[PDB]
C-alpha cells in the first residue's frame, strides 16, 4: 500500500503513472533512474509489500552534502505536482509466486487513488526474433482498448510499429510482469500503454538512453531532439572494484 | 551488475580487458595460514604457522621435501600443492638420473610457471589455487622464490604469503637491511619474530604450531617440529 | 534447482537426478520375494492383460543361470540389457573359476554395472530395481536387492514397485519362523502378500518357485487357482 | 520457439523444425525442371551468373556422374559440389567391384544414405540442396529426386525451386505419357519460361539430355535454335 | 566445447525460418573493414590486378605494407579484408600448391587451386567449431592452352571465373563501369588493360592517383612469370594516361 | 544500486569471488547423511567401530558392508555413499598385492594411501561422496589416516566421522591420553557409540575390528562382542 | 553448460524471469514457528505485542553473537522467552530471545541461523506484528566479507576489518563510524529490519563489519568494540577484562575443519 | 518445460519427454495393419505417395523382405526406416553365416530393439521415429507377428495396428476378431472392412492399398504381394456383402 | 609378425601424417600442424555410433582423399562386416571405460 512519508497522502487527482518492469537488462529501471534524475522529482511515500527481496542504501540521487545521507528502500514513489507526474521505482527482484498479487495490489491502488493512465517501460529478449523483425526497428508499443482516441491518433502520426501477435495472444518473452499488467488492465478497464525494446544483457546504458528518447518523442517532457539527460551520481562502479597488482 | 556475463569462464575477456577467474583464483591464497621465508649470505630459512586445531584429529604438513637442496611451503588448496610437489620431485629425479647434478632452482621455477600457464588459457580447466614459497641452494648461493596462481614468479630477498601477512611483510621490509650478515640462529629468530606479527597481542609462539626448514652450505634440507624447535624458541624476547 | 544434471550436488548433499530415476521404479508393477528354509519364491503382479496379447513375450521373471533367478520393476527396455550382461558374465566367471557363481558375486557385478552409468553427464542411469534370489554352492538360500544408484542389500523378505509400503507392512508382521516351515506355507504367504494390493482375484498373479538342486519352475494358472481356493477356504474357516 | 534452434530435439507434436527450414532454403533457389519422355530425360535450369563479365566455360550447374547419369540441383552450390564428388567416387567404386556400370537407383540410395547422416548428430548442419538425377538403364529412362532429409522419390515430371507449385500445376495439364524427346524439351523450356522473370536467352539457361547414347550437356547453339523454334 | 548459442543469427549451424545463414552473411561485411577496393581485368594476352595502398602513419616502413602476394612462380594473388586472415589463407594456398605438385608431377592450375581453397572454405560453414575467414581471394595466371585466367572465391565457398571483377567497398560501381566497358569492347592490348583498370579505380573513387598510392601486378603470354611493377613504371603509365 | 542474481555453485571448475569451490563443499556436506564411525590409534593397535543402522527388521543384519579388509595388516571404514568406495578399495588391493609380489615385502600404509589419493584427484566428473578411515600397523607402528571428498589424506590420532561427529569428537577430546591400553580404547569406543546412537546397543547394531602387531587383521565376532557389551 | 558437443545453451539472466498437494507440503515444511521451550507450545500473539519494549538489540552471525555473549550477557540475569524454528537448505543454528530481569523492557536476540528470502517477512510478522510502537530503539549487528565492498582501488589494499553504519530518519544520534558509501547496498534480514523501521517511523541503526576472515576470529569480534561507548550499550557493560577472558575461552574451542585448504 | 531438452534427463515424476515426443511423431504416418490366422499371416498398409505425376517402380513402397522367412512394414520417417531395414538384413545374414540356419523372428526383433534402445541413453543423438511390424515363420513357434516402438519395446500380438486411427482400428479388431478359428479368407475380409472404416475416404479404391501374405507350401515359405485385380475383387465382394446386410433389415 | 607388410599396412595414415607434419613444421613453422590437427579433431568428433557405419565426408575433404581410390575402398567392405559386437559394449569401449 502507499505509506506517505509525512502525515497525509498527497492528492494525485489523475496525474499519470510512470513505472518500470523488472525485465531483461534492467532497461526499464535504468530509464526510470534517468527520468527521475533529469526531472528532479521529490519523494512522497513508500509502496510497502512482501513480494520483493529487501534491500537498503543511501540516497542514489545526491547533489549536495546534506541530502546524501537519506536512507532508501526497494520501492519508493516520486512526484512532480507542476507537470502532474508520478513515478515509481523498483530496485530489487521478485520472490517466487509473488508477482500476480503485487500486480493486483498495484492496480487496486491505481484505481483507488484515481489516475488518468499508466505507462510501463519494459524490454524483451533479442534472440527470439524472426527474419522480418531482424531488419526492422527494435522499438514496439502496445495500447489498451480503453485508451483515448487522441492518444491513438498521435501515435499513428508518430509512425511507430506495434508488437506482433501470435496464435491470438500477446506474448512478451523476458518481459516480467508486463503481460500480467496488460491483461489485468484490459480486464479492469484501465488506460495503459507499454513501450519496450529488444535488448541483450551486458552494458545496457545506451538501451535506456534510447528508450527515454523513444518516450520523449510522444510525451515531449523535454526540448525536442534536433547532454540532455542527467546521469545520476550512483552510476559509478558498474563493473566492480579496481585491478589487482602484479598481474599486468 | 554488468560483470555477471564475463566472470564464469577463464577463456572469456571482459569489455574492460580483464579476466576475473584468475583474480578469483588468486583470492584463494589468502585462505591459508601465514608463511615467512628469508635468506642470508649462506643460509635459507622457511617458517610456517600451523592452524589452531586439535592435533588428535589432524596433522597437517605445511613444509614439504622435494630434493636434498630444495624445499617448499604451501598456502591454499591441498590437491594442487600435492600435484605440484609430485611434478617437481619427478623433474628433479629425472634430471639427476639423466645428467647427475643438482637441478637449478631457476630452471625448476621456469618449468613450474610454464606448466601453470596452460589451464589459464585452455577451456575445461581451472587455474591452480595454491601459492608456494621455494627455498633452495645450488652453485649460485641461496635462493628464495614466490609463485602465484596467475602463473607468475618472483625473485625475493624475503617474502610472506597467506592470511594477514601484511604485518609480516612490513616487519621484513623494516628489518631487511641486516639479513646477509647473520648466522643461522639470528636468521631463524628474525623469521620467528616476523611470523609472530600475524597473531593477536595476547598469544605467543609455542612448540605446538611452528615448523622450520633450513638449507645451507653443507646442510641438506631438514624439517624441525614438535620438540625440535625448542632451541630456537628458547631465546626469544616477550614481544 | 540443482536437478538438471546428473553430477551436480545440492547445497545439502543430494543428487536429485538419481533420486528421480527411482520415481520410475516406484511406478512399476509390484514384485515380492520371500526366502524360505529350503525354497525361494518370487511373485509379480500382472497389469493390463490385453485380449490380443501374447503372454509369453511379456514375462517379468528371468533365469540368469542354473541356480539364480531375478525379477524387476521399472522401465522394461532397460532391464533387458542388464539381464543379458549378467547372463554373459555368469558364463565368463564359470570359465574363469570352475565352481558355479555366487549370488553375491552376480549382485555385485550388477550393482557395479548400474553405478557405472551415474558418473557422467553424457549418459543417463538405469531406471530399474531388481530382486536377485538363488542358492549357493553349499546350499544356503540368499536374497538381494539392487537400486538404480548402485547400492545393494541382503533381505529376508521384500517388495518393490507400487504398493511396496503396504506389502512390506504386511510382511513385517506376517513373516515368522512358522510361516516358512513348508514350501506350501511359503507359497501361501507370498500369495497373501500379493493379494493385499491386487484386485480382480488371483488372475493377475505370476509365480516362480526354485528348490535345491533343481531349475526354475513357473506355476500354472490351475495351480495358482488351487492355492487361492485353499487360502480362501482357510480364511473362511 | 524453444525447439526451433536444436537439430536433435523433437517438438511436443513430434516435428523436426530445422529440416523444415532446410527445405525452406531449398524452396528459395533458382527454378529447375525435369521431364521423363518415352525415350529420354531432359533437365533444365536457370543460370545464376546473368552478366557479361562471366566466363562461360568456368562453372556449370548440370554435371555428369557416369556416361549415363547426370544431375542438377536447386539450393546452395558449395553443398552441391561435395555431393557431386562423393557420387562420382561411389560410382567408380561400384564399377571397380562389380565390373558393371552402376544402376541409377543404387546411386540414389547411396547418396540419400550419405545425406541422412547429417540430420541425426549434434554440432553439424543439414545440407541445403535438393537433387534431380536422370539415367538410362536396361533400355528405359529414370528420374529421381532427393530431399535434404535423405528421402527420395521417382517422378514422371517435376519442378522445384522458386515458384514450383505453379510449375507443377502447369506440368500436370501439359504432360503426355507417350511423348518424344523434342516435345519434352519444348515443354521443359516453356515451364521454365512460365516464371523466368526476365527475357530468356541461350546464355542464362542450361539444358542436358539423356538417351541411349548417354548423358550429354547441350551447347549454346542448340539452345538458341530451340528457343528460336519455340 | 562452449556449446551453440540460441538465436537465428548467432551460430553457424542454425537455419532461419527462411533458410538463411546470417553468420555466413556477416562474414561478407568483414571484407569492408579495411576500406580498400581491388580491381582485376583480363586482356587479350595479359592479366592485371590493381589495388589501393594506404599508409596513414609516417613512422611505418612502407616497404612492409603490401596486399599482392606470390603463390607460385606463375600465379599471383591480391587479398581484400582482414590482414591476418589473408596471410593465413596465402600460406594455406602455398601448402596446397606444393601438395598438388608433389602428388601429380606438374604445376597446379589457377582454377584447380581456387576450387581446392573453396572446398576447404566450405567445411568451416557446416561444423560448430571453426569460423569463416573474413577475406576474399583473386588469382591470375596464364594457361598454356587457354590463355589468361581470372578467378575469385568467397567466404561461403563459392568460386567462379570472370573476364573482369572487383572486390572491396565500391564493388558495385566498379562492376557497372566494367560491364559498360566490356560491352563496348573486349579486345585490348597490354597498355589498354592497365589503363582500363586504373581509369576504373580513379573514376569510382573520384581521385587523382600518385605512383605511391597503388599497386600493380601483371602476367603475360610472352613472360608468364608473375611480376610486380615499380614506382617508375607506374608513374610512366600514369603520365601516359593523363 | 540494484539487487541482481549471480550463481557460482553449479560448476566444479568455478571459483567464487572469495575463492571457494562450492561443489566440493557440497560433496563434503553430503557425508553428513551417513552413519557414525570411530577410529582410535593406540601404542599396540588400532580399533575401528561403526554402526549399521538397520532400518527394518526384515533386513538381514549378518551382512558386512561397513568394514573392509585391504590386506593382512590394513583395515578400513566408510561413511556416506558406500557404492562410491568400490573402485578405491579395488585399486588399493591391486596395488598392495602387486607391490608384495614384486618386492617380497609388505608396503607401508602411506604408500597405499598415496596410491588411493592419486585416483580420487581426477574430477568420473564429480567428487566422491564417501569418507574413509584407513588403519593398520607397520614397522613404524600403528597409525591412522583420514580422507575427505576433497581427495586428500591426513594423519590423525583419534577421529570420528558421520552424522553425529561433533559430539563424538568433543568426547574424544575430553577423554583419551597418549599412553593407554587397547582394551580400554575398545571400551571407550563402545561407550561413545552408545551415547551417539539413538537406539539401544545390541550385538548386531554395530560391528568392529582391530589390527595389532601380533596377529593379522581380525574382525570381532558375535561371541566376542557380547562379552565386551556385557563388560559395560 | 554444454553436456555434449554442439549443444544449444541459453545465457543466464540477472533479473529473474493434482500438483497442489506437492506445493502445499513444501510450503508447510519451510514455515517459521515461534515456540515457548519451557511449555513446548507456540505463541498466539506477536512477541512484541505481548511484552512492552523500550530497547531491542539484534545480532546476526556467529561473530556478533559471540561479541554480545562475551561483553553484554556476562553480567546480569537474562530470561529466555521464546525461540524460532526454521528449515532451509543452509540451516539444518538457533534464534533465541531474552529480556533483562531487573529491567523487563530491554530485549535481546541471538540469531545464528540463515533465514531465506521467503521466510523473512514471516519472521517480521511473528516478531513485530502489526501494531508498531514508535517509542523504541533498535540496534542491528552483522558481518560481511571484504570482497563485497566496492571501491575504485583494489580490495586487497583496504585495511580490514572496519565499521560502517546506516540510519533511519528518526535516529537523532550520531554513529561512531563513517556512513556506508553510495554504490554499496545491503540485503537480507538486516535490510528487512531496517526497511521496516524506516517505513513505520521507528529509530534504528545498522552496524556493518567488513572482514577478511568470515569464521570465528578474535580480531573480527574485537572490531565491534567502539560500539560499547554508545548510548545503546553504555549501561549494559560492567567488566571488560572478564569479557576478554571469556572471549579467549570461547575462542579456544571450534568445530573440526576439512582438508580443502592448508 | 525444463525437462524436455534432451533424452538424458529425468522429470521429477520419472518420465522421458523426448522419447514420448518421438512416439507421438508416429501418429502422422499412414495406417498399417497385421492379422494372424491359422494358416498364414497378413500385412495391409495404406499408400500415401498418391499423385498423378508419380512413377511406379520397385515392388512396394512400405513392405520389405528381410530374408527367406520374414517381412516387415514401417511407419514413421522413411530415412530412418531405410537404415533400420538395412541393419535388419545384415543381422539376419550374420546369424545365417554363424549357425548355417535361419534366424528366429524374436531374436531378430530383439537384436534390432537393442540398437533402437541404445539411441535413447547416450547424449548427443536423436532417437529413431519409426515403428515396425514383423511377420514370419520358424520351426520353434510357427507363424508369428510382432510390433516395435521408438523407445525399444516389443511384443507379440494376434492382431494390431500402427499409425493413423490406430485406436479405432484396434477397438474394431478387438470387437470383431475370433481367436482360434480364423482362415486367410476371413482375415482378408476383416482387414478390408477395418481399412474401409479406418481410412477417411468415402469410397475405397485399389490404388491406395497394398496387401502381402505369408504361408507355407511343401516345406517352403511363400511371400507374395497381391494384385490389383484381387484387391478389386475383394473390395467388390465387401461392398456387395455390406449392401446385402443393409437390405436384409 | 606374420608378414613384413602387415604392420606397414596397419599404420599408414599415421606415418603419412607424421611426414607431412614434420615437413610443414620445418618449412613454415609450428602453427600450421597445430591448426591442421585441431581441424582434424573438430571434424572427427562428430559421427555415428561405433556399431553403425559412417561416411567421413568432411574428414575426407580436409585430408584430400575425396578424389582418390585405394585398396582399402574396394577390398573387404567394412559396411558389410561379417561380425559385430553388442552396441553398449562397443560404445563403452570407445569411451575407454572397459
CSV table of N, CA, C and O in Angstrom, one decimal, chain A residues 140-206:
chain,number,residue,atom,x,y,z
A,140,UNK,N,8.8,-1.2,-30.0
A,140,UNK,CA,7.5,-1.6,-30.1
A,140,UNK,C,6.6,-0.9,-29.1
A,140,UNK,O,7.1,-0.5,-28.0
A,141,UNK,N,5.3,-0.8,-29.3
A,141,UNK,CA,4.4,-0.3,-28.4
A,141,UNK,C,3.1,-1.1,-28.3
A,141,UNK,O,2.9,-2.1,-29.1
A,142,UNK,N,2.3,-0.8,-27.3
A,142,UNK,CA,1.0,-1.6,-27.1
A,142,UNK,C,0.1,-0.7,-26.3
A,142,UNK,O,0.5,0.0,-25.4
A,143,UNK,N,-1.2,-0.8,-26.7
A,143,UNK,CA,-2.2,0.1,-26.1
A,143,UNK,C,-3.4,-0.8,-25.7
A,143,UNK,O,-3.9,-1.7,-26.4
A,144,UNK,N,-4.0,-0.4,-24.5
A,144,UNK,CA,-5.2,-1.0,-24.1
A,144,UNK,C,-6.4,-0.4,-24.9
A,144,UNK,O,-6.4,0.7,-25.2
A,145,UNK,N,-7.4,-1.2,-25.2
A,145,UNK,CA,-8.6,-0.7,-26.0
A,145,UNK,C,-9.3,0.4,-25.3
A,145,UNK,O,-10.0,1.2,-25.9
A,146,UNK,N,-9.2,0.5,-23.9
A,146,UNK,CA,-9.8,1.6,-23.2
A,146,UNK,C,-9.1,3.0,-23.4
A,146,UNK,O,-9.6,4.0,-23.0
A,147,UNK,N,-8.0,3.0,-24.1
A,147,UNK,CA,-7.2,4.2,-24.3
A,147,UNK,C,-8.0,5.2,-25.1
A,147,UNK,O,-8.8,4.9,-26.0
A,148,UNK,N,-7.7,6.5,-24.8
A,148,UNK,CA,-8.4,7.6,-25.5
A,148,UNK,C,-8.0,7.7,-27.0
A,148,UNK,O,-6.9,7.3,-27.4
A,149,UNK,N,-8.9,8.1,-27.8
A,149,UNK,CA,-8.7,8.2,-29.3
A,149,UNK,C,-7.6,9.2,-29.6
A,149,UNK,O,-6.9,9.0,-30.6
A,150,UNK,N,-7.5,10.2,-28.9
A,150,UNK,CA,-6.4,11.2,-29.2
A,150,UNK,C,-5.0,10.6,-29.1
A,150,UNK,O,-4.2,10.9,-29.9
A,151,UNK,N,-4.8,9.8,-28.1
A,151,UNK,CA,-3.5,9.1,-28.0
A,151,UNK,C,-3.3,8.2,-29.2
A,151,UNK,O,-2.2,8.2,-29.8
A,152,UNK,N,-4.3,7.5,-29.6
A,152,UNK,CA,-4.2,6.6,-30.8
A,152,UNK,C,-3.8,7.4,-32.1
A,152,UNK,O,-3.0,7.1,-32.9
A,153,UNK,N,-4.5,8.6,-32.2
A,153,UNK,CA,-4.2,9.4,-33.4
A,153,UNK,C,-2.8,10.0,-33.3
A,153,UNK,O,-2.1,10.0,-34.4
A,154,UNK,N,-2.4,10.4,-32.2
A,154,UNK,CA,-1.0,10.9,-32.0
A,154,UNK,C,0.0,9.8,-32.4
A,154,UNK,O,1.0,10.1,-33.1
A,155,UNK,N,-0.2,8.6,-31.8
A,155,UNK,CA,0.8,7.5,-32.1
A,155,UNK,C,0.7,7.1,-33.6
A,155,UNK,O,1.8,6.8,-34.1
A,156,UNK,N,-0.4,7.2,-34.2
A,156,UNK,CA,-0.5,7.0,-35.6
A,156,UNK,C,0.3,8.0,-36.4
A,156,UNK,O,1.0,7.7,-37.4
A,157,UNK,N,0.2,9.3,-36.0
A,157,UNK,CA,1.0,10.3,-36.6
A,157,UNK,C,2.5,10.1,-36.4
A,157,UNK,O,3.3,10.5,-37.3
A,158,UNK,N,2.9,9.6,-35.2
A,158,UNK,CA,4.3,9.4,-34.9
A,158,UNK,C,5.0,8.3,-35.8
A,158,UNK,O,6.2,8.3,-35.8
A,159,UNK,N,4.2,7.5,-36.5
A,159,UNK,CA,4.7,6.4,-37.4
A,159,UNK,C,5.5,5.4,-36.6
A,159,UNK,O,6.7,5.1,-36.9
A,160,UNK,N,4.9,4.8,-35.5
A,160,UNK,CA,5.5,3.8,-34.7
A,160,UNK,C,5.0,2.4,-35.3
A,160,UNK,O,4.3,2.3,-36.2
A,161,UNK,N,5.5,1.4,-34.6
A,161,UNK,CA,5.2,0.0,-35.0
A,161,UNK,C,4.7,-0.8,-33.8
A,161,UNK,O,5.3,-0.7,-32.7
A,162,UNK,N,3.7,-1.6,-33.9
A,162,UNK,CA,3.0,-2.3,-32.8
A,162,UNK,C,3.6,-3.7,-32.7
A,162,UNK,O,4.0,-4.3,-33.6
A,163,UNK,N,3.6,-4.2,-31.4
A,163,UNK,CA,4.1,-5.5,-31.2
A,163,UNK,C,3.2,-6.6,-31.9
A,163,UNK,O,2.0,-6.4,-31.9
A,164,UNK,N,3.9,-7.6,-32.4
A,164,UNK,CA,3.2,-8.6,-33.2
A,164,UNK,C,2.4,-9.6,-32.3
A,164,UNK,O,2.9,-9.8,-31.2
A,165,UNK,N,1.4,-10.1,-32.8
A,165,UNK,CA,0.6,-11.1,-32.1
A,165,UNK,C,0.8,-12.5,-32.6
A,165,UNK,O,1.2,-12.7,-33.8
A,166,UNK,N,0.7,-13.5,-31.7
A,166,UNK,CA,0.9,-14.9,-32.0
A,166,UNK,C,-0.3,-15.7,-31.6
A,166,UNK,O,-1.0,-15.4,-30.7
A,167,UNK,N,-0.5,-16.8,-32.3
A,167,UNK,CA,-1.6,-17.7,-32.0
A,167,UNK,C,-1.4,-18.5,-30.7
A,167,UNK,O,-2.4,-18.8,-30.1
A,168,UNK,N,-5.5,-15.7,-31.0
A,168,UNK,CA,-4.3,-14.8,-30.9
A,168,UNK,C,-4.1,-14.3,-29.5
A,168,UNK,O,-5.0,-13.9,-28.8
A,169,UNK,N,-2.8,-14.4,-29.0
A,169,UNK,CA,-2.5,-14.0,-27.7
A,169,UNK,C,-1.2,-13.1,-27.7
A,169,UNK,O,-0.4,-13.2,-28.7
A,170,UNK,N,-1.0,-12.3,-26.7
A,170,UNK,CA,0.1,-11.4,-26.6
A,170,UNK,C,1.2,-12.1,-25.8
A,170,UNK,O,0.9,-12.5,-24.6
A,171,UNK,N,2.4,-12.3,-26.3
A,171,UNK,CA,3.5,-12.9,-25.7
A,171,UNK,C,4.7,-12.0,-25.7
A,171,UNK,O,5.1,-11.5,-26.7
A,172,UNK,N,5.3,-11.7,-24.5
A,172,UNK,CA,6.4,-10.8,-24.4
A,172,UNK,C,7.5,-11.6,-23.6
A,172,UNK,O,7.6,-11.4,-22.4
A,173,UNK,N,8.3,-12.4,-24.3
A,173,UNK,CA,9.3,-13.2,-23.5
A,173,UNK,C,10.4,-12.3,-22.9
A,173,UNK,O,10.8,-11.3,-23.5
A,174,UNK,N,10.7,-12.6,-21.7
A,174,UNK,CA,11.7,-11.8,-20.9
A,174,UNK,C,11.1,-10.4,-20.5
A,174,UNK,O,11.9,-9.5,-20.2
A,175,UNK,N,9.8,-10.3,-20.4
A,175,UNK,CA,9.2,-9.0,-20.1
A,175,UNK,C,8.8,-8.9,-18.6
A,175,UNK,O,8.4,-7.8,-18.2
A,176,UNK,N,8.8,-10.0,-17.9
A,176,UNK,CA,8.5,-10.0,-16.4
A,176,UNK,C,7.0,-9.9,-16.2
A,176,UNK,O,6.3,-10.9,-16.5
A,177,UNK,N,6.5,-8.8,-15.6
A,177,UNK,CA,5.1,-8.7,-15.2
A,177,UNK,C,4.4,-7.8,-16.3
A,177,UNK,O,3.2,-7.4,-16.0
A,178,UNK,N,5.0,-7.6,-17.4
A,178,UNK,CA,4.3,-6.7,-18.4
A,178,UNK,C,3.0,-7.4,-18.9
A,178,UNK,O,2.0,-6.7,-19.1
A,179,UNK,N,3.1,-8.7,-19.3
A,179,UNK,CA,1.9,-9.3,-19.8
A,179,UNK,C,0.8,-9.4,-18.7
A,179,UNK,O,-0.4,-9.2,-19.1
A,180,UNK,N,1.1,-9.7,-17.5
A,180,UNK,CA,0.1,-9.7,-16.4
A,180,UNK,C,-0.5,-8.3,-16.2
A,180,UNK,O,-1.7,-8.2,-16.1
A,181,UNK,N,0.3,-7.3,-16.2
A,181,UNK,CA,-0.2,-5.9,-16.1
A,181,UNK,C,-1.2,-5.6,-17.2
A,181,UNK,O,-2.2,-5.0,-17.0
A,182,UNK,N,-0.8,-5.9,-18.5
A,182,UNK,CA,-1.6,-5.6,-19.6
A,182,UNK,C,-2.9,-6.4,-19.6
A,182,UNK,O,-4.0,-5.8,-19.8
A,183,UNK,N,-2.9,-7.6,-19.2
A,183,UNK,CA,-4.1,-8.4,-19.2
A,183,UNK,C,-5.0,-7.9,-18.1
A,183,UNK,O,-6.3,-7.8,-18.3
A,184,UNK,N,-4.5,-7.6,-16.9
A,184,UNK,CA,-5.4,-7.1,-15.8
A,184,UNK,C,-5.9,-5.7,-16.2
A,184,UNK,O,-7.1,-5.4,-15.8
A,185,UNK,N,-5.1,-4.9,-16.8
A,185,UNK,CA,-5.7,-3.6,-17.2
A,185,UNK,C,-6.8,-3.7,-18.3
A,185,UNK,O,-7.7,-3.0,-18.2
A,186,UNK,N,-6.6,-4.6,-19.2
A,186,UNK,CA,-7.6,-4.9,-20.2
A,186,UNK,C,-8.9,-5.4,-19.5
A,186,UNK,O,-10.0,-5.0,-19.9
A,187,UNK,N,-8.8,-6.3,-18.5
A,187,UNK,CA,-9.9,-6.9,-17.9
A,187,UNK,C,-10.6,-5.9,-16.9
A,187,UNK,O,-11.7,-6.2,-16.4
A,188,UNK,N,-9.9,-4.8,-16.5
A,188,UNK,CA,-10.4,-3.9,-15.5
A,188,UNK,C,-10.6,-2.5,-16.0
A,188,UNK,O,-10.8,-1.6,-15.2
A,189,UNK,N,-10.5,-2.3,-17.3
A,189,UNK,CA,-10.8,-1.1,-18.0
A,189,UNK,C,-10.0,0.1,-17.4
A,189,UNK,O,-10.5,1.1,-16.9
A,190,UNK,N,-8.6,0.0,-17.6
A,190,UNK,CA,-7.7,1.0,-17.2
A,190,UNK,C,-6.8,1.3,-18.4
A,190,UNK,O,-6.4,0.5,-19.1
A,191,UNK,N,-6.7,2.6,-18.6
A,191,UNK,CA,-5.8,3.1,-19.7
A,191,UNK,C,-4.4,2.8,-19.4
A,191,UNK,O,-3.8,3.4,-18.5
A,192,UNK,N,-3.7,2.0,-20.3
A,192,UNK,CA,-2.3,1.7,-20.1
A,192,UNK,C,-1.6,1.6,-21.4
A,192,UNK,O,-2.2,1.0,-22.4
A,193,UNK,N,-0.4,2.1,-21.5
A,193,UNK,CA,0.4,2.0,-22.7
A,193,UNK,C,1.7,1.4,-22.3
A,193,UNK,O,2.3,1.6,-21.2
A,194,UNK,N,2.3,0.5,-23.2
A,194,UNK,CA,3.5,-0.2,-22.9
A,194,UNK,C,4.5,0.1,-24.1
A,194,UNK,O,4.1,0.0,-25.2
A,195,UNK,N,5.7,0.5,-23.7
A,195,UNK,CA,6.8,0.7,-24.6
A,195,UNK,C,8.0,-0.2,-24.2
A,195,UNK,O,8.3,-0.3,-23.0
A,196,UNK,N,8.6,-0.9,-25.2
A,196,UNK,CA,9.7,-1.8,-24.9
A,196,UNK,C,10.7,-1.8,-26.0
A,196,UNK,O,10.6,-1.0,-27.0
A,197,UNK,N,11.7,-2.6,-25.9
A,197,UNK,CA,12.9,-2.6,-26.8
A,197,UNK,C,13.6,-4.0,-26.7
A,197,UNK,O,13.7,-4.5,-25.6
A,198,UNK,N,14.0,-4.5,-27.9
A,198,UNK,CA,14.7,-5.7,-27.9
A,198,UNK,C,16.2,-5.5,-27.5
A,198,UNK,O,16.9,-4.7,-28.1
A,199,UNK,N,16.6,-6.2,-26.4
A,199,UNK,CA,18.0,-5.9,-25.8
A,199,UNK,C,18.6,-7.3,-25.5
A,199,UNK,O,18.0,-8.3,-25.5
A,200,UNK,N,19.9,-7.2,-25.1
A,200,UNK,CA,20.6,-8.3,-24.5
A,200,UNK,C,21.4,-7.9,-23.3
A,200,UNK,O,21.7,-6.7,-23.2
A,201,UNK,N,21.7,-8.8,-22.5
A,201,UNK,CA,22.4,-8.5,-21.2
A,201,UNK,C,23.9,-8.1,-21.5
A,201,UNK,O,24.6,-8.8,-22.3
A,202,UNK,N,24.4,-7.2,-20.7
A,202,UNK,CA,25.7,-6.6,-20.9
A,202,UNK,C,25.8,-5.2,-20.3
A,202,UNK,O,25.4,-5.0,-19.2
A,203,UNK,N,26.4,-4.3,-21.1
A,203,UNK,CA,26.3,-2.9,-20.8
A,203,UNK,C,25.1,-2.3,-21.5
A,203,UNK,O,25.0,-2.3,-22.7
A,204,UNK,N,24.1,-1.9,-20.7
A,204,UNK,CA,22.8,-1.6,-21.2
A,204,UNK,C,22.4,-0.1,-21.0
A,204,UNK,O,21.2,0.3,-21.1
A,205,UNK,N,23.4,0.8,-20.8
A,205,UNK,CA,23.1,2.2,-20.7
A,205,UNK,C,22.6,2.8,-22.0
A,205,UNK,O,21.6,3.6,-22.0
A,206,UNK,N,23.2,2.5,-23.2
A,206,UNK,CA,22.6,3.0,-24.4
A,206,UNK,C,21.2,2.6,-24.7
A,206,UNK,O,20.4,3.4,-25.3
